[PDB]
Design a protein around this ligand. Structure first.
Ligand SMILES: NCc1ccc(C(F)(F)F)cc1
Length: 330
């Protein structure tokens, strides 16, 4: 079997991506944020504290004839950005573009953090990292991709994020018309439960390629590209007027700048992120200072190849016996 759905940026900045998901019987469609950095399928629901709901579509488990309360199961997750959500668990039918999973754990949120309430376009998350990170207690649950794995034509899922445009999430197949050149595959470490790989280096604009091992995760649930301070300082040094702002909390640059591109290495292959992808608009409404899409991972502890990097490539999350990652120019 296969599944195919359109993913759309939530705003003019591509701050996040949403993909329609069908839950329950009859179908309740919610626009979820597919996150390859986490492993909980959680949704805004009829149980979420009223004041914490602000325009999101809710899942009403009592209106689904296939929904069953998972007795004694609770979940609570904390994200790298400081956001969090938690609640109880149900099992129900979930579908993504024709691909269906019966008895999938759907995590019903009783409480969400302010930044989830403030994003009216995101009805919850669909975790695509390894199931070892799933927070359901006392009995850990599997991911959507984990549950569908054996039924798929090929045990893979592809991410084709658009720049200021719709894109695609495919399950069980590789669309050979969706990219140019070949797909280059790289090793993955599943020790931290993330799609963790090692980049062979970088170049800034038309600059000389620096061969250096950069360990990081392929994360669709993170907006920006987080890289080591040395790499990031080399990039921003090419932008006249750019600096690191303590008040803003990162690198900022004059909105009138034409940003250089950024290349990352995938084995002997190269992925070019165009300059426009690194512009995240004014730091505050009306300001002539713009926020950068390339930031230092010094305070994080791990490098993150988020949407800024991933949207420049056709990305294969290969769930074979030994998982790998595939990257191609598009
Ligand atoms: N990295 C996971 C994640 C995804 C979305 C959000 C936000 F922005 F919706 F709160 C926070 C954290």
């Amino acid at each position: 079997s296969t599944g195919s759905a359109t993913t759309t940026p939530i705003d003019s900045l591509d701050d996040a991506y949403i993909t329609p998901v069908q839950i329950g019987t009859p179908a309740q469609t919610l626009n979820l944020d597919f996150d390859t950095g986490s492993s909980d399928l959680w949704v805004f629901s009829s149980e979420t504290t009223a004041s914490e709901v602000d325009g999101q579509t809710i899942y009403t488990p009592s209106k689904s004839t296939t929904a069953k309360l998972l007795s004694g199961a609770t979940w609570s997750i904390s994200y790298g950005d400081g956001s969090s959500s938690s609640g109880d668990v149900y099992t129900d039918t979930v579908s993504v573009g024709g691909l269906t999973v019966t008895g999938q754990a759907v995590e019903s949120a009783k409480k969400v953090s302010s930044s989830f309430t403030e994003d009216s376009t995101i009805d919850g998350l669909l975790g695509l990292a390894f199931s070892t990170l799933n927070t359901v207690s006392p009995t850990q649950q599997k991911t959507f991709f984990d549950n569908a794995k054996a039924s798929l034509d090929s045990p893979v899922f592809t991410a084709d994020l658009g720049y200021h445009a719709p894109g695609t999430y495919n399950f069980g197949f590789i669309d050979t018309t969706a990219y140019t050149g070949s797909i280059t595959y790289t090793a993955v470490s599943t020790k931290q439960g993330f799609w963790e790989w090692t980049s062979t280096g970088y170049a800034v604009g038309s600059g000389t390629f620096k061969s250096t091992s950069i360990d990081g995760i392929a994360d669709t649930g993170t907006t920006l590209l987080y890289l080591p301070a040395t790499v990031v300082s080399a990039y921003w040094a090419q932008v006249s007027g750019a600096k690191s702002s303590s008040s803003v909390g990162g690198y900022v640059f004059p909105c009138s700048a034409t940003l250089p591109s950024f290349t990352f290495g995938v084995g002997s292959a190269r992925i070019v992120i165009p300059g426009d992808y690194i512009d995240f608009g004014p730091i505050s409404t009306g300001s002539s200072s713009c926020f950068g899409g390339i930031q230092s991972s010094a305070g994080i502890g791990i490098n993150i190849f988020g949407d800024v990097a991933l949207k420049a490539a056709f990305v294969v999350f290969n769930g074979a016996t030994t998982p790998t990652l595939g990257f191609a120019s598009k």
